[PDB]
């Protein structure tokens with residue numbers, strides 16, 4: 086019944102850690118439409134409203150065929166998030182940007198969190214989050230700090246629903262889902278296994 | 280010349296096949312869209328001298344490994360007359376993913392299932408005629424199967440494929456848009472030593 090915030094990012098980007106910070110727990114929830122796996126999930130008060138956070142498996146390619154990538158698409162297809170809170174490791178920004186841009190092409194509602202930003206600056210990495218936000222057309226926040234500003238932006242991004250956005254997102258996944266369906270189909274018929 | 284792109288995952292016997300098809304005479308060469316040198320050789324298939332290019336093994340057509348980026352860049356700027364796709368039969372349950380990603384580009388494809396004997400001993404029974412029918416792509420098993428595979432390749436080079444180059448490039452433009460955006464944002468917003 087509550088609006089859904091999905092945590093999305095690559096593996097080991099601090100997602101479970103952020104989840105624990107937001108919820109104060111490590112609750113796992115199963116019986117999600119479309120997937121059999123149990124995921125870290127919890128509901129929080131965000132201002133006056135209650136919202137549901139779900140930590141999605143870390144993945145490298147939105148359109149890839151690793152098991153985690155399949156699970157993420159199934160979840161997103163059948164449980165279109167009201168917000169994708171995309172977590173990027175500042176220290177590895179060059180290598181992590183692709184997932185963000187892929188998710189943006191799904192036509193989801195996104196807020197970007199640039200994690201480990203101090204560690205980045207301790208190396209020689211400087212990030213202009215205003216410029217990044219400007220070019221992306223997406224809110225971008227750095228976390229060292231930055232957390233309360235990030236939550237504020239979450240509330241703003243959930244304030245006005247978009248009719249037809251579930252159908253839009255489902256449609257952008259269809260091509261990957263077709264490949265998967267064809268795999269299952271052809272393997273079931275043409276390949277016999279022990 | 281006509282061009283065949285040899286495509287498969289790593290450790291599928293692609294190197295040994297390319298060596299055989301090119302008779303040991305392959306040389307290094309540069310190609311538009313990539314800065315790396317690739318190996319290619321000549322082979323006579325029916326009426327045509329054909330150039331076969333050995334592309335780096337990849338796992339995910341849309342992934343961001345260096346090899347994957349080179350294969351996509353190569354394909355975009357050098358659309359092959361035939362993609363010759365080599366899968367490991369024992370790992371057919373997963374490796375089907377790359378074949379279907381490549382089909383989705385609207386390429387002209389022949390599939391070779393290598394190590395088909397090993398697969399049968401693992402208890403994996405593949406019915407390649409049925410698989411060919413369902414894919415609408417010719418499928419041939421190797422272990423020997425080489426002559427038959429190469430006659431299908433020759434046949435797959437005969438019919439017209441009008442607009443294909445345009446179709447393949449169009450299908451790859453999603454990937455190139457991601458890459459273009461990545462560069463744009465990284466240049467303007469990020470300074471790394």
Ligand SMILES: Nc1nc2c(ncn2[C@@H]2O[C@H](COP(=O)(O)OP(=O)(O)O)[C@@H](O)[C@H]2O)c(=O)[nH]1
Nearest residue numbers: 096097098099100101102103143200201204229
């Ligand atoms: N420097 C820094 N490290 C973090 C932060 N959040 C998580 N990490 C570390 O990143 C690694 C992976 O964290 P985790 O929550 O397990 O990532 P997950 O796989 O995405 O859930 C661990 O070493 C964490 O302690 C952060 O805000 N700053």
